[PDB]
């Protein structure tokens, strides 16, 4: 259950490279991989990369190709040839040594973060307050705007009011003092 | 075709996804301005229908026809976080400027921990008093409402206030005496 | 018009969302998933499918017990019938 | 706050989507962690229910106690019982208008 | 209102009332 510390390899890794992986977890100080891995073992003789996979040895191995940030780290270990079991990666993708498994644990730590916010979603509508026999029944831009009763008929002012900048021109304002 | 299947499943996925985001965006810009008369009824609508249809989605797109997580692994062609501006045209949405340390902890599993850090505090706190009704609790009520809703209206396939031969023999034996010879 | 046709069709619908509500929440009710079926992951994915009910599961739960009443009373206000077709408190 | 929260709601809606998209294009024992998941469910799942129960029972219980003067269903017959029947122009039911006899003006 | 009250344009006429409310 080692893989949820997120710490990284940053001078216990002189190099993230194929075989340098080996010999950065050689040497585990103090973060860049598991103390036990075939460190020891491989720092018997010398900075290695037979404990990777070569010999049989439990080192962060070159699992396959990577020079640019660093090797994925499998702590490889097989008694024949061509495998490498996995818990972890001492890699600096991400910055850190994660699970090294599936997507799975990456969509289910996205979907149990996005829950956190959902029920927060759910609880902050939930006590705001309620509908009820009246919508919240309790306790026993409306009142008025422009006019209620305000009937047609001699609305016929409208008619006429259709006289009048007629019966005069308005007057240019463009002045707000 | 077998690896167009898994493109067409991490498409399908992303797409459903932006657009619920996109829904979740656009429904927000009317809930903020026009704060007054929301009901609850209307806005759980709408997060019922983009939550939901995602997530239904969202598991089905992984455990049916997806290929083997055990022999592929992860791995990108380099590494290089340069912001170029011919890489933009390959997400549709997202991945606007990808940078390398300027993000230490932004994704990983979407980083929310309400449930593996609980089970550790909590990982010891029933030895033998239960694990009975538990996992074997699926067995108790199985059927209490599913034998009901089809054998009331499904099952069909109204009181008569007309009689459709009271009123052809009324009309003929009103005018005359046909039929009474 | 016709809208007793309309009120039979509310109240149709009215009862068969809440026939789903009772139906469409109990997918967790009667089980807890005692076994690991899910072929991508039981730790992550098993984990969360239970801790988002309020996506999965309370989204249904959430109006199907408050739209109950809600229907109700609009269909108990919007016929106010008084309709015994001879107003038996007129003649007295 | 009710713009703060759409903008965090919206914020968190987009970081999924992107950490969603860039996990897309890099692509290409005695835990029980799932019992307390269903019963923290089944928990949340009572207590709507009993909210639920209380907002019916806390609501509408009007009539219930003591029949007091409420237009839902208990004021509205009073009068029309009394003077007319169900009648909608746009709220208006039954004007008292004499014109079952008037044949004046409306 | 204060603001700026720099409404020009023209119409000046209209009606703004409301009323209906008998059957038309």
């Given at each position: 259950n080692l893989l949820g510390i997120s710490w990284v390899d940053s001078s216990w890794i002189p190099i993230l490279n194929s075989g340098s992986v080996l010999d950065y977890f050689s040497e585990r100080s103090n973060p860049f991989y598991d103390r036990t891995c075939n460190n020891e073992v491989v720092k018997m003789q010398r900075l290695t990369?037979?404990?990777?996979?070569?010999?049989?040895?439990?080192?962060?191995?070159?699992?396959?190709?990577?020079?640019?940030?660093?090797?994925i780290i499998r702590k490889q270990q097989r008694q024949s040839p061509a495998q490498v079991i996995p818990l972890a990666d001492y890699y600096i993708i991400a910055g850190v040594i994660y699970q090294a498994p599936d997507l799975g644990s990456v969509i289910n730590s996205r979907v149990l973060t996005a829950?956190?916010?959902i029920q927060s979603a759910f609880d902050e509508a939930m006590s705001y307050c309620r509908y009820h026999p009246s919508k919240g029944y309790w306790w026993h831009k409306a009142k008025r705007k422009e006019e209620p009763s305000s009937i047609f008929q001699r609305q016929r002012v409208d008619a006429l009011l259709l006289d009048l900048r007629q019966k005069f021109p308005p007057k240019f304002v463009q002045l707000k003092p | 075709?077998?690896?167009?299947?898994?493109?067409?499943?991490?498409?399908?996925?992303?797409?459903?996804?932006?657009?619920?985001?996109?829904?979740?965006?656009?429904?927000?810009?009317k809930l903020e301005n026009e704060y007054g008369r929301l009901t609850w009824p209307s806005v759980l609508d709408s997060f019922a229908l983009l939550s939901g249809q995602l997530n239904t989605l969202n598991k089905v797109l992984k455990h049916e026809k997806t290929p083997l997580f055990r022999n592929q692994v992860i791995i990108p062609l380099v590494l290089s976080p340069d912001r170029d501006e011919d890489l933009m045209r390959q997400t549709?949405?997202?991945?606007?400027?990808?940078?390398?340390?300027?993000?230490?902890?932004?994704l990983r599993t979407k980083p929310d921990p309400?449930?593996?850090?609980?089970?550790?505090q909590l990982t010891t706190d029933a030895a033998r008093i239960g694990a009975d009704a538990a996992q074997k609790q699926i067995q108790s009520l199985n059927k209490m409402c599913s034998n009901l809703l089809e054998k009331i209206s499904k099952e069909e396939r109204n009181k008569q206030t007309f009689n459709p031969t009271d009123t052809n023999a009324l009309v003929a034996a009103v005018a005359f005496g046909k039929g009474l010879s | 018009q016709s809208k007793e046709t309309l009120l039979q069709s509310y109240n149709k619908r009215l009862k068969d969302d809440i026939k789903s509500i009772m139906d469409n929440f109990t997918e967790i009710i009667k089980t807890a998933k005692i076994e690991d079926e899910t072929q991508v992951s039981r730790a992550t994915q098993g984990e969360q499918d239970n801790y988002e009910m309020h996506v999965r599961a309370a989204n249904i739960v959430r109006a199907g017990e408050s739209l109950m009443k809600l229907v109700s009373d609009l269909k108990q206000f919007l016929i106010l019938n008084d309709f015994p077709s001879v107003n038996e408190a007129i003649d007295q | 706050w009710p713009w703060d929260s759409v903008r965090n709601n919206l914020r968190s809606a987009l970081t999924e989507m992107c950490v969603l998209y860039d996990v897309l294009?890099?692509?290409?024992?005695?835990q029980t962690l799932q019992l307390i998941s269903k019963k923290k469910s089944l928990a949340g799942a009572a207590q709507i229910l009993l909210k639920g129960a209380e907002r019916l029972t806390k609501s509408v219980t009007?009539?219930?106690?003591?029949?007091?003067?409420?237009?839902?269903?208990?004021?509205?017959?009073?009068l029309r019982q009394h003077w007319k029947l169900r009648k909608v122009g746009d709220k208006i039911l039954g004007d008292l208008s004499y014109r079952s006899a008037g044949s004046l003006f409306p | 209102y204060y603001k700026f009250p720099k409404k020009k344009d023209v119409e000046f006429l209209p009606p703004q009332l409301p009323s209906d409310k008998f059957k038309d």
């Open positions: 990369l037979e404990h990777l996979n070569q010999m049989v040895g439990i080192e962060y191995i070159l699992l396959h190709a990577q020079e640019p940030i660093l090797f829950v956190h916010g | 075709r077998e690896e167009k299947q898994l493109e067409a499943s991490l498409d399908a996925l992303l797409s459903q996804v932006a657009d619920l985001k996109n829904s979740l965006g656009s429904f927000i810009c549709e949405g997202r991945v606007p400027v990808f940078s390398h340390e300027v993000v230490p902890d932004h309400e449930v593996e850090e609980q089970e550790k | - | 294009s890099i692509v290409r024992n005695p009007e009539n219930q106690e003591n029949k007091l003067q409420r237009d839902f269903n208990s004021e509205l017959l009073r | -």
